[PDB]
Design a binder for this molecule. Sequence first.
Ligand code: BCL
Ligand code: BCL
Ligand code: BCL
Ligand code: BCL
Ligand SMILES: CC[C@H]1c2cc3[nH]c4c(c3C)C(=O)[C@H](C(=O)OC)c4c3nc(cc4[nH]c(cc(n2)[C@@H]1C)c(C(C)=O)c4C)[C@@H](C)[C@@H]3CCC(=O)OC/C=C(/C)CCC[C@H](C)CCC[C@H](C)CCCC(C)C
Ligand SMILES: CC[C@H]1c2cc3[nH]c4c(c3C)C(=O)[C@H](C(=O)OC)c4c3nc(cc4[nH]c(cc(n2)[C@@H]1C)c(C(C)=O)c4C)[C@@H](C)[C@@H]3CCC(=O)OC/C=C(\C)CCC[C@H](C)CCC[C@H](C)CCCC(C)C
Ligand SMILES: CC(C)=CCC/C(C)=C\CC/C(C)=C/CC/C(C)=C/CC/C(C)=C/CC/C(C)=C/CC/C(C)=C\CC/C(C)=C/CC1=C(C)C(=O)c2ccccc2C1=O
Ligand SMILES: COC(C)(C)C/C=C/C(C)=C/C=C/C(C)=C/C=C/C(C)=C/C=C\C=C(C)\C=C\C=C(C)\C=C\C=C(C)\C=C\CC(C)(C)OC
Ligand code: HEC
Ligand code: HEC
Ligand SMILES: CCCCCCCCCCCCCCCCCC
Ligand SMILES: CCCCCCCCCCCCCCCCCC
Ligand SMILES: [Fe+3]
Ligand SMILES: [Mg+2]
Ligand SMILES: [Mg+2]
Ligand SMILES: [Mg+2]
Ligand SMILES: [Mg+2]
Lengths: 342, 273, 53, 53, 53, 53, 49, 245, 287
Amino acid sequence: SPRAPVWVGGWFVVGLITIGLLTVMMGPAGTYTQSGYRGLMMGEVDMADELADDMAAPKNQVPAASERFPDEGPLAGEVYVNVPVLAHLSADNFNRLMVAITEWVSPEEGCNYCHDPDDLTAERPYTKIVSRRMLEMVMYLNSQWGDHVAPSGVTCWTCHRGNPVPENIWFKNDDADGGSGALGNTFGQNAASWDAGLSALPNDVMEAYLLDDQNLRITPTNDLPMNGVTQIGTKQAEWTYGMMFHISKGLGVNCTYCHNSQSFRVWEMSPPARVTAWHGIQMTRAINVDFLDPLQPEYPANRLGPEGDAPKANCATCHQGAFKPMYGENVIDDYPSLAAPG
Amino acid sequence: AMLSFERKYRVRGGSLIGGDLFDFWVGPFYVGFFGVTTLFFTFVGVALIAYGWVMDPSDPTVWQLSIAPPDLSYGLGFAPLMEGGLWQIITICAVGAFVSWALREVEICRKLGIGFHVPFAFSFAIAAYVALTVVRPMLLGAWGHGFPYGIMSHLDWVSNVGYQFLHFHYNPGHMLGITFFFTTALALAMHGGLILSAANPGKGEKVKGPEHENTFFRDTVGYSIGTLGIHRLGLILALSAVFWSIVCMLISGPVWTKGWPEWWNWWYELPIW
Amino acid sequence: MTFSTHKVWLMFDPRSTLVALAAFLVVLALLIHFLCLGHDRFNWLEGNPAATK
Amino acid sequence: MTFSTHKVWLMFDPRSTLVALAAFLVVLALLIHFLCLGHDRFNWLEGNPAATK
Amino acid sequence: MTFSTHKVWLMFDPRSTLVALAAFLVVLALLIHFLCLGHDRFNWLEGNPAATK
Amino acid sequence: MTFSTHKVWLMFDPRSTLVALAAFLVVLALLIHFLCLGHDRFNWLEGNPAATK
Amino acid sequence: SSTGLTEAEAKEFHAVYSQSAAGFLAVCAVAHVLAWMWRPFWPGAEGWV
Amino acid sequence: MIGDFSSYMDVAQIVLYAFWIFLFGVIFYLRREDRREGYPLERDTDGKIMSIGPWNLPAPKIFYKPQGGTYSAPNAARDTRAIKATRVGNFPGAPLDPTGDPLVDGVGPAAYAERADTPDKTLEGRTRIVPLRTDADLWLAPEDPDPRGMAVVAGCRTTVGAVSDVWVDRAENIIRYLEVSLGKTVLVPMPMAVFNDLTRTVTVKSMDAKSFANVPTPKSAEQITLREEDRIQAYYAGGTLYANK
Amino acid sequence: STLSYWLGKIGDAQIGPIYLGATGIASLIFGFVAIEIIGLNMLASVDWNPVEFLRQFPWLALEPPGPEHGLRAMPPLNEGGWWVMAGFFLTASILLWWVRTWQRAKDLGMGTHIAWAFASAIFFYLVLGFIRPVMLGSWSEAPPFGIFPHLDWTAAFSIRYGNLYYNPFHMLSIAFLYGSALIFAMHGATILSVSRLGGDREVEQITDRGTAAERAALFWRWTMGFNATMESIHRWGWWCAVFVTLTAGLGILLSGTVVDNWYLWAVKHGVAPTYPDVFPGVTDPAA
Ligand code: BCL
Ligand code: BCL
Ligand code: BCL
Ligand code: BCL
Ligand SMILES: CC[C@H]1c2cc3[nH]c4c(c3C)C(=O)[C@H](C(=O)OC)c4c3nc(cc4[nH]c(cc(n2)[C@@H]1C)c(C(C)=O)c4C)[C@@H](C)[C@@H]3CCC(=O)OC/C=C(/C)CCC[C@H](C)CCC[C@H](C)CCCC(C)C
Ligand SMILES: CC[C@H]1c2cc3[nH]c4c(c3C)C(=O)[C@H](C(=O)OC)c4c3nc(cc4[nH]c(cc(n2)[C@@H]1C)c(C(C)=O)c4C)[C@@H](C)[C@@H]3CCC(=O)OC/C=C(\C)CCC[C@H](C)CCC[C@H](C)CCCC(C)C
Ligand SMILES: CC(C)=CCC/C(C)=C\CC/C(C)=C/CC/C(C)=C/CC/C(C)=C/CC/C(C)=C/CC/C(C)=C\CC/C(C)=C/CC1=C(C)C(=O)c2ccccc2C1=O
Ligand SMILES: COC(C)(C)C/C=C/C(C)=C/C=C/C(C)=C/C=C/C(C)=C/C=C\C=C(C)\C=C\C=C(C)\C=C\C=C(C)\C=C\CC(C)(C)OC
Ligand code: HEC
Ligand code: HEC
Ligand SMILES: CCCCCCCCCCCCCCCCCC
Ligand SMILES: CCCCCCCCCCCCCCCCCC
Ligand SMILES: [Fe+3]
Ligand SMILES: [Mg+2]
Ligand SMILES: [Mg+2]
Ligand SMILES: [Mg+2]
Ligand SMILES: [Mg+2]
């Protein structure tokens, strides 16, 4: 059969209509905000519809709080028996806090999730024991970690968001290691893991930084090597990078939110959000070391991890994909009881 | 008539505006209407870059010189001359100068009676520059999306734009462009070496012809592209590299607004598995 | 092929067939030895206890 | 192909057809063996209990 | 190949066969030596205790 | 090759064989010296104690 | 014809091919029966329990 | 510190400057190789040879050609053929105007180089470009249309003739020229021809009916020299500027 | 020696025959051992499942030893010993392939220019995998054998040594890669434009200059004021391609050995741009 010469103009029109196909197919274009200097391109790249949907998500709507009773009446420590951490609240405020906590942690299961159905005084369920340490942790976070959580504060809704198990929790060997026998060592990486943003980066970094105090500072403070300072660290850089993937995914931001890529090391070129993130790293490590990990004996086997360790919190446990938890909604002003230990 | 064989080729013709006024040479360079426009835009742009250099309060060196685009708040509008307007005017002059260079090459090709493959290939570099400074900024709604005109600051722009997606290496168009750029260097090394080996066979050997050239690659890789096929292959490789660079930058921001590694969830969670 | 199919070599070149068979057999032996090294019970150089569960 | 379709070898070259079927059979055998190795119950070298659940 | 099959060299070129065999044997020897060095009990230069567990 | 097998060089080029042997021997010596340097007991320039454990 | 074989050569090649393929399939069936007796490979409604 | 020579200088800076020296030397060497053809330069007004330093012009290198002979570069040979073009006033850079027919004279885009007056050979010493009617070991791939028999249309939409044969490169298996019998036979370079297999036509937009009648022809009808090839190709290339206008 | 219609459209249609020789067979044996090691470690990393292998192949790799092993000549297998073996066998196969290319050039009477262009890439590969880890005394500084992992290594290497954009040899290597693409597009377009004049037959144009070479030279002379010859442009391209990997090896040698922070190196030498302080009161909270 004769070969037909290619219709250049017709295929050019087809190319134009395919460009239209691409435009309708793959974007109304993302919305930009500029945080740094011009020409640097430090800022946020967000789809407007997706950002609006995440703000209008049910988890980002802090439940309405009832009017607070005047703190002048019979305390909860005399009316009730087993209230070691809430013995300074007026009984009316104690009941208001119980209702709020039920709305925040177990709205579906109701008051019976953390209480014996026929005895509110009995510390039978493990959930009551865990909730007491939850209350203590929230008070500790509000009183002692205002460098990070103020002025918004943290309540039971900040992590739990209306269900007993918070959405973003982690364990020690959260990503199953690969390799059979003497072959296939994945080295805690080389997998399509969502902890590393679906990259082949170290996906089990939360243990080194949010439970351990390992160094995230890989970049030297001098241009030339020192005699006692290490001259290597490319693989150690991958651990920091994976941790920064976790941080970026937990806040729904990019690297430029806290860094100038010209030098990831220089704080003077960094947005003031990097200072809040430093306090956040310290606070998350404190949370895991002091409250969430020592709760392992109180958990059933259904709640533990592959390594038998307690569930732990990270940047994404509170923020849930936003730069601030619930995008900055104040949650502690309505509940002064959760703002400081008694 | 500078080269020993150039006199017979210096004739009238090739103008794209239909006129003999600009048809002349200054030294080795051919001057056209588009040569004049190229020099006009070039001197304007270079003088404005020097102005922005001497008006910089930080006393930068040649490496630290930077004429930055306007803020993203100015949108697709007009900025003060010291607040992005200088970058805008230099961008307009650069686009004009590059298009004029391509059109002058078209004029030279018409005068020499050869094909327009060179202006056409340079149009791909011009399209990459335009997609970086004009098209992508309009797709994103602000001229502040273009890169600053500085030797070292445009590297910082590249770095921060890449880290806006948390791992730019995972961009599929970026992967394709890098593959094509590295393959272009591989093919250029192979071709230059083969032609130099055929033209310089050594001591006691005659200059090898097309049979030896084809035999060397059929004996090494198992396939010979030929002497006409190698140049088509090289042009195609370079043009594909630049085209995929344009695609990867036009899908970053206008299309993809999240991390690039998670785009591969289409393959990791393909409906098959 | 069988002990009596001597005419297969009127269709397959003995030299090339022997070379391809040697390459395939060496590759398969390496594969199986690596699969034995890639399992705790059958890695004879690691010397794990035979009972592995 | 059937026991009576002896004229298929008037269309396919027997030597090249046998090398493409041998290659395909070896690749298929490798794929199925690796599929068995890739699952807890049918990995005969890992030796998990048959009730993997 | 046996002590009496001297006619193999009328079918296999001695020079290329010897060079390919030398290459294969060197690669095999290097691979086995490296596999021994890659295990605790058989790295003779690291000198771990023989009782490796 | 043996002391009395002098007809090697009627099959193998003496000069090419010598150059290839020199290259192979130099590379092998470099490899084994690197092996010694890469182990604590046999790194003679680092001078660790012979008792290494 | 096209490949360059007589119908008699093709018949002999098909005879040996059919014998070899039948032997291969018989060995594969025996191996599959042996593997089923080792561990059945079609799960029930409950799985591998 | 580790890689420092002073409080400012360091090893990387010195290695960078050493590479700068090496790169500038390489560029100098490359620019010397660029001057193996066309140098020394000449003036645009009287043809006076300009003096170039011996450090910019390399010593001649000898090419031992595959079929015999030695080419040197530079070679002290200068193209001094009379150009049939004039200009008003010998001003530097003033372009020239052909006196007569620029295509036949070889002026500008029709200009050609005085190459070897012998046909190009292959490794075995047989003519590289020959018509397909002479060689039986070479045929045309059945997947591609056969140019032979196709009508030949010039740039003025006039059927000037038909394709009678194809000249094939025996060293690369590629069609180099089309032998076109004008409705008396001419060679059309294949890159200058566009094929339409549905209408069975070959369009050569670089030629008119007048230009086809003046196309240079090889001395032999089965043999073409490098100079004849060069002249014919230059004629068709100059037709892009001088034919349809 | 089969034919290929599709490849015969862009170029020639003949595929083969290929000459391997002694060094070719040796290189294939070494390289197959390396590839088997890498691929079997990748397949074992997904617990031998080919479904998971297909899912995760870009993410899979053979990983170098950790920093805890240093430059141990042969680490434990599943702790980087497989990587060291794969690197050794790949290096041996690549070196034997270089010898093969040199020999193929010699036996054809041709110059050894492709071999010495391959030597530059081999130098870069060796700096990446062997030479630099030896000087730094750590196998961990070497790239993994994986698709996405060596991109992760690339990014983490740039991050570890302070923005490799500020490495002057990285700048030079990028300039030379851009110039390789530029020069090769220039040359392909130029030769295609003079293909109507016989310009694709470049070696015949080298020993006998035709109007194609003259017009190719004059186009660039009239465009940018200077030109090359039909042979010199190939030296230009050869050197531009060689310098890519030469400067790449040079800039990787200097990272961690003599320079540990490249951005601070540029700050010392007045290369890093200084930007107006948009964030006036941000300091290190750990200071
Ligand atoms: C093994 C001995 C004979 C043979 C004996 C028979 C007999 C008897 C029959 C077939 C039938 C078929 N054969 Mg047969 N067949 C042979 C070799 C082949 C080869 C090959 C390239 O080797 C192929 C692709 C096939 C393909 C096929 C199918 C296209 C066709 C029907 C599909 C089917 O029933 O199962 C689906 C396909 C598969 C499961 C994969 C196909 C591959 C295998 C080899 C198919 C063989 C199935 C057959 C029942 C084997 C019986 C041999 C025993 C000695 C009984 N045969 C050899 C020469 N074959 C049947 C038919 O024509 O339909 C009415 C049929 O009754
Ligand atoms: C070493 C001295 C002789 C030799 C003497 C013998 C004798 C005697 C016998 C064989 C046998 C065999 N030889 Mg032999 N064989 C030689 C060289 C070779 C070469 C080669 C290219 O160098 C190869 C690939 C082989 C391969 C083989 C096998 C195909 C075959 C049995 C397989 C086997 O034992 O499994 C293991 C095979 C391998 C792991 C690969 C092969 C490697 C070595 C060289 C195989 C030698 C095995 C043989 C039993 C050792 C006997 C040598 C003693 C000095 C007697 N021989 C040289 C020329 N060989 C046996 C046979 O055919 O009987 C049915 C047998 O009885
Ligand atoms: C060194 C002096 C002689 C020599 C004298 C002998 C004598 C005597 C014998 C051999 C034997 C052998 N030789 Mg020799 N051999 C020489 C050079 C070589 C070369 C070479 C390219 O240089 C090679 C590859 C070989 C290879 C071989 C083996 C194939 C064979 C078995 C020995 C062995 O253990 O294998 C392992 C091989 C290697 C690890 C590589 C081989 C390298 C060296 C050169 C092997 C020499 C071994 C031999 C004991 C040296 C002793 C020298 C003393 C002064 C006697 N010889 C030179 C020419 N060779 C033996 C044999 O044929 O068995 C019946 C034997 O009795
Ligand atoms: C080893 C001795 C003989 C030989 C003797 C026999 C005998 C006897 C039989 C076969 C049969 C077969 N042979 Mg045979 N066969 C030989 C060489 C080969 C080669 C080869 C290229 O080396 C191949 C691919 C085959 C392939 C085959 C199969 C197609 C076929 C049955 C498949 C099978 O058994 O399942 C498993 C097959 C494989 C996993 C592929 C490998 C095949 C193996 C290597 C062949 C040996 C199997 C045989 C039963 C063992 C006899 C050897 C003893 C130690 C003496 N043979 C050599 C020349 N072969 C059978 C048949 O045709 O059925 C009617 C049969 O009865
Ligand atoms: C100037 C610098 C550029 C460059 C140069 C360069 N590279 C080169 C050359 C040159 C000039 C060569 O001569 C050489 C070559 O041959 O190229 C085609 C080579 C080469 N450049 C290569 C790749 C390459 N170059 C790269 C880059 C570049 N190379 C630079 C940009 C890159 C990148 C971007 O990372 C890569 C990946 C190779 C194609 C080749 C060297 C090949 C080699 O080393 O082979 C030995 C290694 C092996 C693993 C052997 C193969 C093992 C397989 C298992 C083979 C199959 C065996 C099987 C038995 C076959 C039969 C199977 C049966 C079923 C049929
Ligand atoms: C498309 C494939 C590749 C390509 C092709 C290509 N480029 C080409 C050609 C071709 C085929 C030419 O014919 C043409 C040429 O003549 O080359 C010698 C050209 C050319 N490629 C050039 C460079 C170049 N090509 C590049 C890339 C590529 N070119 C691709 C990889 C790059 C990169 C990657 O950075 C550069 C720098 C020029 C040498 C030349 C075009 C010269 C030209 O346009 O001249 C007219 C303009 C001026 C003389 C100056 C104008 C200045 C402005 C008025 C102000 C400055 C604006 C600028 C944006 C500032 C930048 C600051 C910092 C970012 C540094
Ligand atoms: C009205 C008025 C004001 C009049 C004044 C007129 C004046 C002053 C001038 C004329 C008008 C104009 C516009 C002049 C231009 C001025 C300028 C700015 C000139 C320089 C522009 C320019 C792009 C310069 C070169 C820049 C660089 C570094 C380019 C890269 C080149 C490179 C990497 C290597 C060089 C390799 C070469 C030489 C390649 C060319 C080349 C190629 C590509 C072949 O394939 C080929 C094939 C066969 C034979 C020869 C060749 C050959 O020479
Ligand atoms: C199951 O698998 C089968 C069998 C099907 C085979 C398939 C295999 C497959 C699919 C393999 C895929 C492999 C891939 C995708 C590999 C990708 C690799 C990439 C991208 C690598 C990138 C960079 C790597 C570099 C630069 C590595 C360099 C390493 C070097 C130079 C190491 C040198 C080491 C030496 C010289 C060691 C010497 C030995 C000493 C001297 C130490 O001994 C003491
Ligand atoms: C788990 C998230 C709980 C839910 C659901 C409810 N309560 Fe609670 N309760 C919880 C804790 C941790 C404590 C101890 C307080 C302390 O200071 O340690 C309590 C205690 C009470 C009591 C006191 C009973 C007693 O001491 O005798 C009462 C009366 C009580 N809570 C009431 C109550 C109501 C009404 C709830 C539904 C709105 C409810 N609880 C849910 C934890 C949790
Ligand atoms: C705010 C939520 C941040 C985001 C977004 C990113 N980073 Fe991070 N970075 C942040 C802090 C608080 C710190 C200091 C941690 C400490 O222990 O001091 C850092 C530090 C780094 C570093 C190392 C700096 C050094 O001195 O070596 C690197 C390499 C780094 N950050 C990289 C990085 C990347 C790649 C990011 C995008 C994925 C990214 N950061 C985002 C806070 C925040
Ligand atoms: C100059 C007055 C102060 C600033 C007013 C706002 C200027 C920006 C908004 C208007 C112009 C932007 C849109 C321009 C479109 C140009 C399309 C070619
Ligand atoms: C001060 C630094 C000087 C650097 C000079 C570099 C010169 C490089 C020359 C390379 C080419 C040499 C000639 C090769 C001809 C072909 C040989 C087969
Ligand atoms: Fe070329
Ligand atoms: Mg893990
Ligand atoms: Mg994890
Ligand atoms: Mg966001
Ligand atoms: Mg010092």
